């Protein structure tokens, strides 16, 4: 996979944000993870949702560099959202959320699952440590 620069426009929630990619605005959605809901009514404001949002917001807004890494399959979902692994100062946001027990590994559609195993290892560690979602 290859990383590419991007610029933060606005963090929306734990796993969705607006970035400037190729001088164009885009909403992106993290690959292989699912942070709890804070918006959609027919889902409600789930526990750890506000937490996942703040963890993410803090991480991306205080970063000097943000990079996007698309996987080997399709790059956008049905809603026109960019699908990627996002790094804040070299730290993958997707993994960080999972490691903290603030997101579960979800939506694994091959071939967009190159980092699936790394992430699952991180989730297993958070489970055994009984972190947040796992407590
Ligand atoms: C992460 C991811 C989400 N999605 C879809 C699945 C879900 O569709 P439905 O909304 O139809 O269930 C939605 C989950 O995103 P989050 O709440 O942002 O929904 O986006 C993909 O299609 N591919 C992906 O790789
Ligand atoms: Ca979500």
């Amino acid at each position: 996979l290859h990383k590419e620069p991007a610029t933060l426009i606005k963090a929306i929630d734990g796993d969705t944000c607006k970035l400037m990619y190729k001088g164009q605005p885009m909403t992106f959605r993290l690959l292989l993870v699912d942070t709890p809901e804070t918006k959609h009514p027919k889902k409600g404001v789930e526990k750890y949702g506000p937490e996942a949002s703040a963890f993410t917001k803090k991480m991306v807004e205080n970063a000097k560099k943000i990079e996007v890494e698309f996987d080997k399959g399709q790059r956008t979902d049905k809603y026109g959202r960019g699908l990627a692994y996002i790094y804040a100062d070299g730290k993958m946001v997707n993994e960080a959320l999972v490691r903290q027990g603030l997101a579960k590994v979800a939506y694994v559609y091959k071939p967009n699952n190159t980092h699936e195993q790394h992430l699952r290892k991180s989730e297993a560690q958070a489970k055994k440590e009984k972190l947040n979602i796992w407590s």
Side-chain angles (χ1 to χ4, degrees):
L1 304 187
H2 166 257
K3 305 198 211 307
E4 300 180 57
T7 297
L8 191 263
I9 292 183
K10 173 182 184 294
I12 298 168
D13 65 344
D15 61 17
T16 305
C17 59
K18 233 94 63 74
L19 300 174
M20 216 30 89
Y21 173 72
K22 302 261 161 294
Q24 238 297 272
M26 270 187 87
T27 120
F28 269 80
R29 172 62 166 78
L30 298 173
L31 275 177
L32 308 168
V33 302
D34 171 353
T35 44
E37 195 58 60
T38 58
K39 266 60 179 184
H40 199 294
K42 321 174 194 77
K43 243 295 182 181
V45 174
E46 311 188 301
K47 230 290 166 192
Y48 296 116
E51 284 69 36
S53 286
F55 185 88
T56 294
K57 191 177 187 286
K58 238 71 68 197
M59 189 166 173
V60 305
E61 287 182 350
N62 295 131
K64 301 184 303 182
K65 305 170 168 180
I66 286 174
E67 301 164 296
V68 301
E69 181 177 69
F70 288 106
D71 208 329
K72 59 210 176 183
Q74 62 199 78
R75 293 108 149 81
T76 58
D77 65 8
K78 57 183 176 209
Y79 300 102
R81 296 180 309 182
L83 293 176
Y85 296 111
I86 292 168
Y87 300 77
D89 287 336
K91 280 73 79 173
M92 202 203 283
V93 182
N94 318 49
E95 193 268 327
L97 284 168
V98 160
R99 181 58 183 88
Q100 287 290 304
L102 292 173
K104 323 84 171 183
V105 166
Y107 304 111
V108 188
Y109 308 123
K110 341 302 168 180
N112 275 354
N113 65 337
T114 296
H115 298 313
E116 178 178 23
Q117 255 46 78
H118 174 66
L119 262 272
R120 273 177 194 312
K121 99 184 178 186
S122 295
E123 186 182 57
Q125 190 50 53
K127 273 176 296 178
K128 55 188 66 177
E129 288 176 16
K130 306 296 169 293
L131 282 168
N132 301 297
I133 285 171
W134 304 115
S135 53

